[PDB]
Symmetry: D3
Subunit: 70 residues, 6 copies
């Protein structure tokens, strides 16, 4: 785990939406911003993610778009 992703943003898990195969984690990344992650449940279990846990959203730059207010 040294990854090419510059976007490795730290926060605490606030919610986990549990499903059959995929679920949704909710991290408080700090500053009143929150990130949501659709990931496989195999991994949500494997990594030991429960509510209040410490993890990072790890996002590759080419998957981030940009928007403005016009």
């Amino acid at each position: 785990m040294k990854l090419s992703a510059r976007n490795q943003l730290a926060g605490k898990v606030v919610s986990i939406k549990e499903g059959a195969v995929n679920g949704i984690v909710v991290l408080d990344i700090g500053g009143g911003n929150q990130i949501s992650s659709t990931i496989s449940m195999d991994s949500i279990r494997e990594l030991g993610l429960q509510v209040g846990s410490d993890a990072y959203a790890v996002i590759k730059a080419t998957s981030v778009m940009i928007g403005i207010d016009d």
Copy 2:
């Protein structure tokens, strides 16, 4: 215009690395957090992205991974 991205990370553009086809924008997203977004140069112009401009990081929830410490 209201989209499926719950991940709308609002921040101020800090840098733009310009390339032939795509470039790399940087928002200072707050909380000491910084995001990198590789996108087309054409898009960077049409939105009017310069340093210190207000924009949002738009990240699809299925593009977010989770990592933890070791």
Copy 3:
């Protein structure tokens, strides 16, 4: 917002496959073309998508591939 995507293809919503966590929306963009988008169900509700709703599919250019016969 606007969004940096050149690929903002407008069409009419024809179907919603409802799931436990995600769903599948399908828009008719015209010319015999349809696009499907798997998104979280909570967002399907947040965007207010009903059958027959008018919308745009939003695809990042670096997310589109090209293939040939």
Copy 4:
């Protein structure tokens, strides 16, 4: 060449922007709809993509978003 992508949209290429590493191709998919695909320049040659050629936009469903308003 059968593939998991639901979106395999046929069209004619109208422009190609060449770059050092990647390029951007643009397809006329019909109906006043056009999709652009940022891909590697290496792959653009291997398929033989020049202007007006027949190809498909291939978009994985989990890569498509939806918009309104």
Copy 5:
């Protein structure tokens, strides 16, 4: 297709879900790849366990990591 990464392997497991599924390919050499895809897509391709298929992954979506 424009993806240089078209890695052939044999389907080892398929986890089925309401809308999505996960296929797992053993592409050879102690390597295994998993693909989260729609059930519409898993059924249409006729993917049974052990059938011969390819994992096809876009270059700009692959990251690189090392260990210290």
Copy 6:
């Protein structure tokens, strides 16, 4: 511990340089190769040279499956 189901181990075979992005190709063993387009500055932090030990990292939702 990153959530990627695809963490493919291999040695760097080539690094194609660009102004903003570059493209690495790994031999993950068994005649398989992966290509990863990433920022040149990110190749900086990771220090990738040819013949280096690294992993190709792919999230499950970006993998498609194809067949004959």
